[PDB]
C-alpha cells in the first residue's frame, strides 16, 4: 500500500495480474451511504391554526 491513500501497488506475474484485476472488478464497489438521522416536513394548514395545532400536539 501507498500509505493510507486508497492506492495499492501490487506486483506479480502477468497471469496472476490479469486474474486478480478481473476479480477486483467484480467484488469491489464503493460503500453505501447512510440515509440521515433527521428529516423535515412542512404542512400548509388550511382550516386549523398552526399555533393551536402545535400547542395541541405538545400538550400545552
Amino acid at each position: 500500500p501507498v500509505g493510507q491513500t486508497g492506492q495499492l501497488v501490487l506486483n506479480g506475474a502477468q497471469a496472476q495480474l490479469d486474474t486478480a484485476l478481473a476479480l477486483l472488478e467484480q467484488v469491489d464497489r464503493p460503500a453505501p451511504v447512510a440515509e440521515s438521522r433527521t428529516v423535515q416536513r412542512v404542512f400548509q394548514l388550511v382550516n386549523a391554526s398552526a399555533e393551536e395545532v402545535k400547542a395541541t400536539l405538545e400538550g400545552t
Partner: peptide
C-alpha cells in the same frame, strides 16, 4: 447543537451559520 440565526432589521436579512446539514434545513424553509 442548532444553527445560529442572525436577523438584521435594517436590511431585512436572515443569516444562518452552522454545519452544512443544519444550513440546508433553513435554506429549504
Amino acid at each position: 447543537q442548532q444553527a445560529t440565526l442572525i436577523a438584521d432589521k435594517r436590511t431585512n436579512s436572515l443569516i444562518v451559520r452552522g454545519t452544512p446539514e443544519q444550513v440546508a434545513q433553513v435554506a429549504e424553509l
